[PDB]
């Protein structure tokens, strides 16, 4: 059993001063084994925060993120799951076959994670799982202001992943539980 935090698009401090208090209340050191961050933290402060939560922090570079030592994309292995991580503002030209061939690697995973849109999605398709954790600070994107702050915890065990989506909907924290099993 491994617990994974999936979040991103915090945009601190430029669109948000910090993670929603109600979310910080839920995140304590010593629980989570891995953090996958879709980028757009926008500062070392947040990275340092995440490192207090878990040692194994995988983050990728989002549009305009300062750090260069952040890979654009990665494939991580947790349990028996290959997990692909990319910010999601790449938006690749089809006709560029070479880049396309490289992409194969990112599509050939059990769990695909990306961000950028600040809009949460989670669903299983053809024995793969797709997650967009949305914005943990509910930061606005260029398209709209009312973004439900959300993040995801994945509990991974063997060939099963239970994904818990947390959303700050007004006053309260709502949780949907989504089960994904690989065959």
Number of H helices, E strands in the chain: 3, 11
The CB-of-115 to Mn ion minimum distance in angstroms stands at: 6
The CB-of-157 to Mn ion minimum distance in angstroms stands at: 14
Q: Which residue's CB is nearer to Mn ion, number 14 or number 31?
A: 14
Q: Which residue's CB is nearer to Mn ion, number 63 or number 121?
A: 63
Q: Which residue's CB is nearer to Mn ion, number 31 or number 177?
A: 177
Please tell me whether residue 175 adopts helix, strand or coil conformation: strand
Question: Rounded to the nearest 5°, which phi and psi values hold at 89?
Answer: -105, 30
The CB-of-55 to Mn ion minimum distance in angstroms stands at: 25
Tell me which residues touch Mn ion (CB under 5 A): 9, 40, 62-63, 89, 116, 181
Token reading at 16: 């948000």
The CB-of-180 to Mn ion minimum distance in angstroms stands at: 6
Q: Which residue's CB is nearer to Mn ion, number 95 or number 145?
A: 145
Element (H, E) at 48: helix 44-53
Exposure b/e, 140-168, CB count within 10 A at least 16 = b: ebeeeeebebbbbbbebeeeebebebbbb
Question: Rounded to the nearest 5°, which phi and psi values hold at 72?
Answer: -70, -35
């Amino acid at each position: 059993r491994m617990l994974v935090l999936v979040l991103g698009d915090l945009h601190i401090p430029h669109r948000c001063n910090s993670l929603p208090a109600k979310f910080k209340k839920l995140l304590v050191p010593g629980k989570i084994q891995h953090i996958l961050c879709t980028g757009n933290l926008c500062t070392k402060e947040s990275y340092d925060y995440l490192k207090t939560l878990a040692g194994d922090v995988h983050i990728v570079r989002g549009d305009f993120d300062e750090n260069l030592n952040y890979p654009e994309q990665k494939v991580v292995t947790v349990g028996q799951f290959k997990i692909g991580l990319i910010h999601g503002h790449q938006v690749i030209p089809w006709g560029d076959m070479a880049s396309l061939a490289l992409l194969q690697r990112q599509f050939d995973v059990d769990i695909l994670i990306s961000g950028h849109t600040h809009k949460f999605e989670a669903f299983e398709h053809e024995n793969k799982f797709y997650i967009n954790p949305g914005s943990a600070t509910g930061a606005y994107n260029a398209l709209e202001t009312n973004i439900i702050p959300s993040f995801v915890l994945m509990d991974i065990q063997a060939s099963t992943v239970v994904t818990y989506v947390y959303q700050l909907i007004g006053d309260d924290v709502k949780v949907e539980r989504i089960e994904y099993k690989k065959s």
